Amino acid sequence: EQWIKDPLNIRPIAHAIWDPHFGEGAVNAFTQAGASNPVNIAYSGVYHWFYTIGMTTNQELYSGAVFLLVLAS
Amino acid sequence: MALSDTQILAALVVALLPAFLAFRLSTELYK
Amino acid sequence: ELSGQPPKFGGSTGGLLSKANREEKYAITWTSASEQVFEMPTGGAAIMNEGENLLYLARKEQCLALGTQLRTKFKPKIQDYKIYRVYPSGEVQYLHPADGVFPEKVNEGREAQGTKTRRIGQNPEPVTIKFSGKAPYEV
Amino acid sequence: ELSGQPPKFGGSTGGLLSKANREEKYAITWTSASEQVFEMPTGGAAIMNEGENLLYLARKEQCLALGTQLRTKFKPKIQDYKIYRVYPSGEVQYLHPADGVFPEKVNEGREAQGTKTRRIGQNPEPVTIKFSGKAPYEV
Amino acid sequence: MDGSYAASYLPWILIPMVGWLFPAVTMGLLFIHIESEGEG
Amino acid sequence: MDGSYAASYLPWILIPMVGWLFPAVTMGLLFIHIESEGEG
Amino acid sequence: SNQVVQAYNGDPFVGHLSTPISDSAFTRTFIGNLPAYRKGLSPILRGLEVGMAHGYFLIGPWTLLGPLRDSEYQYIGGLIGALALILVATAALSSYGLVTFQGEQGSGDTLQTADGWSQFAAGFFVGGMGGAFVAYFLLENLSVVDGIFRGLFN
Amino acid sequence: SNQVVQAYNGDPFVGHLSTPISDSAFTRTFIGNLPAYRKGLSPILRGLEVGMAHGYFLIGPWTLLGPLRDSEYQYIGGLIGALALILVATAALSSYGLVTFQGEQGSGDTLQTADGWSQFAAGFFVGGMGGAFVAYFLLENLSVVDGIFRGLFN
Amino acid sequence: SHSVKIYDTCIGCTQCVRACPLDVLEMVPWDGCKAAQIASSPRTEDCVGCKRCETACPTDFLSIRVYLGAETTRSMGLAY
Numbered sequence: 001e002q003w004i005k006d007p008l009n010i011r012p013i014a015h016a017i018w019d020p021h022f023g024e025g026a027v028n029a030f031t032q033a034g035a036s037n038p039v040n041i042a043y044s045g046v047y048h049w050f051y052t053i054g055m056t057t058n059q060e061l062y063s064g065a066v067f068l069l070v071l072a073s
Numbered sequence: 074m075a076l077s078d079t080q081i082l083a084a085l086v087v088a089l090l091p092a093f094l095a096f097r098l099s100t101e102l103y104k
Numbered sequence: 105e106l107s108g109q110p111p112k113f114g115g116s117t118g119g120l121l122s123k124a125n126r127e128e129k130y131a132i133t134w135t136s137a138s139e140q141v142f143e144m145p146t147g148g149a150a151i152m153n154e155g156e157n158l159l160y161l162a163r164k165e166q167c168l169a170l171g172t173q174l175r176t177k178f179k180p181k182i183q184d185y186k187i188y189r190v191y192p193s194g195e196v197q198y199l200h201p202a203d204g205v206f207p208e209k210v211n212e213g214r215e216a217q218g219t220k221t222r223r224i225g226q227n228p229e230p231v232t233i234k235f236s237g238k239a240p241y242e243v
Numbered sequence: 244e245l246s247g248q249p250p251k252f253g254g255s256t257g258g259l260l261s262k263a264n265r266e267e268k269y270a271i272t273w274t275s276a277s278e279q280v281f282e283m284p285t286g287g288a289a290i291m292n293e294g295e296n297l298l299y300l301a302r303k304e305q306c307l308a309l310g311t312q313l314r315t316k317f318k319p320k321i322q323d324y325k326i327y328r329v330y331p332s333g334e335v336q337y338l339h340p341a342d343g344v345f346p347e348k349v350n351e352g353r354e355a356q357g358t359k360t361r362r363i364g365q366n367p368e369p370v371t372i373k374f375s376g377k378a379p380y381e382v
Numbered sequence: 383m384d385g386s387y388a389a390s391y392l393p394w395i396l397i398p399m400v401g402w403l404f405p406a407v408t409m410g411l412l413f414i415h416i417e418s419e420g421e422g
Numbered sequence: 423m424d425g426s427y428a429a430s431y432l433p434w435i436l437i438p439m440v441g442w443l444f445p446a447v448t449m450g451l452l453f454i455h456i457e458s459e460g461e462g
Numbered sequence: 463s464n465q466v467v468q469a470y471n472g473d474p475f476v477g478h479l480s481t482p483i484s485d486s487a488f489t490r491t492f493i494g495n496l497p498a499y500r501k502g503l504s505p506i507l508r509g510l511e512v513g514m515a516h517g518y519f520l521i522g523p524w525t526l527l528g529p530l531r532d533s534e535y536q537y538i539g540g541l542i543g544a545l546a547l548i549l550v551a552t553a554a555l556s557s558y559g560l561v562t563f564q565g566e567q568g569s570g571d572t573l574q575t576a577d578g579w580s581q582f583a584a585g586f587f588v589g590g591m592g593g594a595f596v597a598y599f600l601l602e603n604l605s606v607v608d609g610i611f612r613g614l615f616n
Numbered sequence: 617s618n619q620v621v622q623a624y625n626g627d628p629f630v631g632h633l634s635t636p637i638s639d640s641a642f643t644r645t646f647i648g649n650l651p652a653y654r655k656g657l658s659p660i661l662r663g664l665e666v667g668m669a670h671g672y673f674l675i676g677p678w679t680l681l682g683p684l685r686d687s688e689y690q691y692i693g694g695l696i697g698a699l700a701l702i703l704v705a706t707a708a709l710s711s712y713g714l715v716t717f718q719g720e721q722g723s724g725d726t727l728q729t730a731d732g733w734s735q736f737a738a739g740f741f742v743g744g745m746g747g748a749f750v751a752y753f754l755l756e757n758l759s760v761v762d763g764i765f766r767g768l769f770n
Numbered sequence: 771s772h773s774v775k776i777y778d779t780c781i782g783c784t785q786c787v788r789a790c791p792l793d794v795l796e797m798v799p800w801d802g803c804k805a806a807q808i809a810s811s812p813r814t815e816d817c818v819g820c821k822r823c824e825t826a827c828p829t830d831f832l833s834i835r836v837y838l839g840a841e842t843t844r845s846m847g848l849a850y
């Protein structure tokens with residue numbers, strides 16, 4: 001949703017990093033794109049695809065994830 | 074807005090169902 | 105050895121426990137003219153085969169209740185069942201009917217055991233047999 | 244039993260491993276007119292005794308390489324070696340030469356096995372033998 | 383490491399579970415299975 | 423106890439080694455040896 | 463056929479049923495590879511694994527719900543409760559083994575002899591107090607375990 | 617003669633050599649009296665001695681070189697690393713024993729059976745975590761051990 | 771074990787038998803060639819798959835063919 005507000009100067013975020021091997025320098029370096037935790041910047045086009053199809057909220061993404069869980073079931 | 078803790082735990086409880094179904098399918102494909 | 109086909113049964117929780125392989129079990133054999141359904145004494149219904157049938161049960165009373173059902177609940181009365189006691193060593197002891205004749209009918213060669221030559225009211229007093237280890241009915 | 248003196252050898256790391264006492268080993272026996280030095284197939288040089296010699300090796304190929312050396316690298320050609328397979332149960336199976344004659348020379352009583360009555364180019368197509376479990380050369 | 387997201391204790395428990403417990407259990411079961419001299 | 427000499431950790435480790443480890447090891451090996459009913 | 467409910471080990475007169483809970487392939491390969499049933503195990507190893515799991519989990523209820531849970535010695539009280547319960551459980555296990563295998567010893571399960579059950583009880587003791595102390599040592603230096611899992615020291 | 621290099625057990629065709637490293641009298645009396653080879657030992661005692669030595673020495677590398685070595689929990693991190701490594705080693709030992717001794721059991725070494733190897737793995741576990749905790753307890757109260765060895769308290 | 775097959779273009783030169791280092795092949799009497807002998811493979815359980823016999827064969831499109839199949843201790847040439 002933060003990327004929804006400004007989809008030209010905010011880097012998309014793939015997922016959060018939970019690596020106990022990180023030092024303080026790598027924690028500060030990967031705390032990027034407005035996050036408060038170390039994250040990876042997504043490059044798959046994923047944020048642009050879900051913006052072009054009209055999805056605007058994380059709750060819709062969660063509902064679709066539960067839907068794909070039961071579809072896989 | 075962000076999701077809740079209960080949402081995340083409910084999603085994991087849901088994900089227990091395709092885990093069991095994948096175990097069943099892999100067991101049936103093995104024989 | 106004991107011969108007979110087992111009656112076809114889906115299985116039940118009421119059947120043999122570890123006493124069967126540990127202490128004893130019981131067997132009932134009977135010949136059947138046709139294939140019909142009987143009631144298991146351990147709950148449920150089983151189908152007895154045509155010809156010889158051999159069933160394993162936990163107690164003698166279950167076998168005798170089955171034999172009572174065989175004599176009383178079938179229009180051709182199955183009156184030839186044999187009930188045995190089976191030990192885990194493999195020895196099979198024949199129980200019922202012991203002399204080949206049902207016990208409600210008299211037979212020669214049967215010895216009177218448990219018979220008392222006195223009446224019920226002429227048992228002696230307990231005070232007469234104190235510190236003997238024997239009851240009024242045992243003397 | 245297998246007879247022959249072991250060739251005198253200082254020992255080597257190239258010899259028998261646990262497969263010899265676990266699965267199988269091989270033996271080569273040969274008669275020698277004199278005492279001369281041969282090359283071990285496991286590296287190094289050994290001295291073979293005058294008379295019977297019995298050598299234990301790990302593989303059949305090592306015994307046959309030794310036999311090739313015996314036939315080709317000695318001026319009196321040792322042409323009477325016998326190669327056996329020895330099992331840990333103690334059974335000794337005679338291997339080479341199997342009929343008493345070296346296999347490059349023909350002998351009557353030898354049955355043709357692995358022989359095909361068709362040419363190499365007239366093997367059938369694989370598509371003709373699908374889901375049969377057998378290769379074109381096995382049919 | 384930390385997280386502002388919901389249930390931030392879940393990476394704390396699940397990264398060692400998916401990195402250590404799951405592969406050690408899987409390779410142990412697979413090693414016992416692929417060396418089973420049962421029937422063939 | 424302390425020492426101004428070089429490698430003062432060496433009495434610290436070697437006094438228990440020569441007082442405890444060496445005699446206990448030596449008497450254990452000697453007790454096993456002098457009771458060995460091997461050949462004679 | 464398609465019926466998943468069958469007679470237990472092919473005998474319809476034994477009082478049990480072949481069910482997907484009782485006699486599925488997962489059930490046999492899981493229960494039969496539990497330490498109490500795992501083939502080839504010495505009984506001390508069976509008892510050791512059982513005790514480690516049991517003593518490890520028995521730390522928790524008194525740690526989080528006991529009378530010391532709101533003091534500074536909460537993990538201490540959880541550990542003492544778990545150790546005392548494991549002691550009572552080991553005494554019960556050994557007394558059961560003394561009572562059950564008085565007479566002749568079977569040639570089947572090594573576990574179901576007096577020798578094997580005593581080995582199992584010894585393993586259960588050692589594992590129970592080991593698991594209780596390792597769970598206490600994790601809980602008492604839980605800040606260090608948290609810093610390790612978050613990379614705070616590195 | 618004077619040649620110290622001979623055939624291994626008098627057989628020159630077995631792939632080994634009788635060397636002063638491989639087959640000296642010191643080598644036989646040392647290796648054959650190690651717990652893995654010491655005659656008459658129950659396999660749990662073999663595993664126990666092996667584990668005590670191994671868990672005691674495995675404290676050191678993470679204690680002095682691990683990521684917690686410059687924190688206040690240096691001995692803690694060394695102990696947790698050693699305990700986890702001993703746990704993985706015990707799991708590997710028990711899985712090897714389950715795999716190797718599936719079939720018939722030999723009448724020779726008691727160690728090389730499923731029963732004996734399970735006993736050995738149980739002993740290795742108990743010894744490994746015991747040796748790791750005793751080396752940690754020496755290192756965490758190293759000031760007391762130093763004062764004891766210097767007579768500072770007496 | 772590997773499979774060794776001998777086809778009817780064999781002219782009984784015995785070169786495959788001489789080249790074989792594991793005593794897989796013999797020569798048996800035959801009538802299809804002027805030499806009146808054909809190679810045979812009774813001992814394919816000892817065959818390692820080295821294809822020296824194929825290298826020795828002089829008939830164009832060789833009369834002996836080795837097909838690598840099931841792998842054993844003998845076929846992989848293991849001394850351990």
Ligand code: CLA
Nearest residue numbers: 016017018019020021026030040397400401404405408409
């Ligand atoms: C010592 C080296 C090392 C190690 C061990 C790790 C370890 C880790 N890093 Mg990492 N990292 C390192 C150096 C290292 N890092 C360095 C130098 C950098 C540069 C600064 C990073 C940057 C970095 C980022 C940016 C991220 C990580 C992440 C991770 C975690 C991935 C765990 C995961 O998803 O599941 C375990 C691993 C996998 C599932 C990968 C699968 C690959 C294998 C080969 C597949 C094998 C399949 C095959 C069939 C085998 C059979 C299956 C088996 C179960 C039997 C893990 C804790 C990620 C994280 O935090 O996770 C959320 C993450 O986003 N790291």
Ligand code: CLA
Nearest residue numbers: 015016017018065069081084085088392393394396397400
């Ligand atoms: C296949 C898609 C996928 C992928 C690549 C990942 C990848 C990751 N997840 Mg994740 N997750 C997924 C699906 C997936 N997730 C789903 C569907 C759910 C449930 C809604 C979750 C719930 C979840 C949680 C709660 C957490 C992660 C975390 C993580 C990270 C570390 C790994 C871990 O601890 O997993 C743990 C994952 C689970 C416990 C859930 C199981 C995941 C799915 C259901 C199984 C999919 C199996 C796969 C498709 C089978 C084929 C695999 C292939 C090798 C053959 C890593 C980036 C951790 C994290 O955020 O680290 C920063 C974390 O704490 N995931």
Ligand code: CLA
Nearest residue numbers: 020397398401402596607610678682683684693696697700
């Ligand atoms: C992807 C998964 C993953 C994860 C999460 C980690 C995580 C970690 N690695 Mg690591 N590593 C990985 C993969 C991973 N590694 C791979 C793939 C490689 C190379 C091939 C390495 C190579 C590597 C080296 C070389 C070292 C580490 C170390 C460390 C730890 C640094 C902090 C510390 O001292 O830990 C201490 C904590 C532990 C070692 C484990 C703690 C586990 C618990 C608390 C103990 C056991 C609890 C109990 C008995 C069992 C619970 C039972 C039940 C509840 C499950 C950290 C926990 C360092 C290390 O181990 O320091 C000791 C170190 O030296 N890593």
Ligand code: CLA
Nearest residue numbers: 425427428429430431432433434435436437438439440441
């Ligand atoms: C035989 C002569 C001799 C004698 C009587 C001593 C006596 C002593 N040494 Mg010493 N030492 C000697 C030779 C000797 N040393 C030599 C040659 C060296 C090597 C250069 C050392 C190196 C040494 C160190 C580093 C330390 C001592 C220490 C000590 C004291 C405590 C014992 C101990 O820990 O020993 C430990 C000794 C060694 C580790 C070295 C082995 C000693 C020699 C080489 C062996 C001699 C064996 C003997 C001759 C065989 C016959 C014995 C007889 C009973 C049959 C004690 C006063 C400790 C000390 O200063 O305490 C305050 C200490 O830390 N010594």
Ligand code: CLA
Nearest residue numbers: 437438440441442443672750751754761763764765767770
């Ligand atoms: C000549 C050698 C020697 C040395 C160095 C000592 C040293 C000591 N004696 Mg002693 N003693 C000796 C001979 C010696 N004695 C003899 C010959 C006698 C009489 C016949 C006595 C009779 C005596 C009495 C009656 C008492 C002492 C006590 C003590 C200790 C006082 C401090 C303390 O509490 O220790 C505590 C430390 C220890 C007892 C040993 C610590 C060893 C380590 C730290 C523990 C084990 C570590 C690990 C598991 C093994 C390592 C494996 C590998 C690395 C080797 C001190 C260490 C007192 C004592 O033991 O207090 C407890 C005591 O009451 N001594």
Ligand code: CLA
Nearest residue numbers: 398399402403519521522523525526597600601607700703
């Ligand atoms: C009355 C019910 C009750 C209560 C109140 C508790 C309470 C508790 N349980 Mg518990 N439990 C119960 C019933 C209960 N349990 C039952 C019925 C079972 C099943 C038999 C369990 C099984 C169980 C396990 C398996 C664990 C707990 C743990 C805990 C503690 C977690 C809270 C905490 O401080 O986090 C602190 C959380 C941790 C310290 C976890 C750190 C991560 C651990 C080490 C696992 C990491 C996995 C990793 C792969 C290990 C590496 C080693 C090797 C395999 C590589 C807490 C005291 C945990 C505990 O006691 O930890 C010491 C724990 O691990 N419980």
Ligand code: CLA
Nearest residue numbers: 546548549550551552553554555556557558560583584587
């Ligand atoms: C003076 C003799 C004596 C002593 C010091 C011990 C000491 C011990 N016994 Mg023990 N025991 C004894 C005689 C003794 N026993 C006798 C005669 C029997 C045969 C009935 C037993 C049968 C027995 C069993 C079956 C078990 C123990 C166990 C234990 C240990 C746990 C602590 C304990 O029981 O409370 C301290 C004990 C005392 C202060 C006095 C005990 C004396 C009475 C006769 C014991 C009564 C038996 C009873 C069932 C066990 C007590 C259980 C405990 C919860 C109270 C401890 C080392 C347990 C253990 O972990 O062993 C590895 C265990 O499983 N004992």
Ligand code: CLA
Nearest residue numbers: 438439442443673675676677679680681751752754755761
């Ligand atoms: C990466 C390599 C590496 C690293 C970094 C270490 C690091 C360490 N090792 Mg180690 N070690 C290694 C490899 C390594 N080791 C290998 C390969 C082996 C061989 C298997 C050993 C065997 C070894 C032993 C045997 C000991 C160490 C010890 C130590 C610690 C000594 C430093 C210190 O604080 O002194 C502190 C020094 C002490 C506390 C020693 C006090 C005296 C002890 C108790 C011996 C006294 C002998 C006495 C007779 C015992 C009495 C009992 C009875 C017999 C009477 C340190 C953490 C010591 C240790 O961990 O102590 C807990 C120790 O005793 N190491």
Ligand code: CLA
Nearest residue numbers: 403406407410411495496510511514515704706707710711
């Ligand atoms: C729910 C069942 C269950 C539970 C609670 C345990 C618990 C335990 N097992 Mg175990 N095990 C199980 C089933 C189980 N096992 C089964 C079915 C097998 C047969 C394959 C094994 C085979 C096995 C071996 C060979 C060993 C253990 C060991 C252990 C202890 C070390 C901690 C551990 O493994 O991580 C906690 C475990 C879990 C949270 C779940 C484990 C469930 C899977 C099926 C285990 C997979 C087997 C795998 C090779 C062992 C795990 C190794 C570990 C490093 C992850 C622990 C008490 C070790 C030990 O010290 O024993 C004395 C050891 O050497 N187990």
Ligand SMILES: CC1=C(/C=C/C(C)=C/C=C/C(C)=C/C=C/C=C(C)/C=C/C=C(C)/C=C/C2=C(C)CCCC2(C)C)C(C)(C)CCC1
Nearest residue numbers: 514515516518519588591592593595596741742745746749
């Ligand atoms: C859910 C589920 C399940 C369940 C599971 C469980 C229930 C688990 C648990 C778990 C647990 C329960 C775990 C435990 C573990 C334990 C351990 C791991 C222990 C350890 C111990 C130790 C380590 C000890 C040691 C020692 C000693 C011996 C002495 C010295 C010191 C010490 C203390 C260290 C199942 C699979 C069924 C199914 C599916 C799902």
Ligand code: SF4
Nearest residue numbers: 790817819820821823
């Ligand atoms: S492949 Fe090698 S071993 Fe096999 S038959 Fe041909 S030459 Fe002999």
Ligand SMILES: [Ca+2]
Nearest residue numbers: 529530531532
């Ligand atoms: Ca309170």
Ligand SMILES: [Ca+2]
Nearest residue numbers: 615616683684
């Ligand atoms: Ca650090």
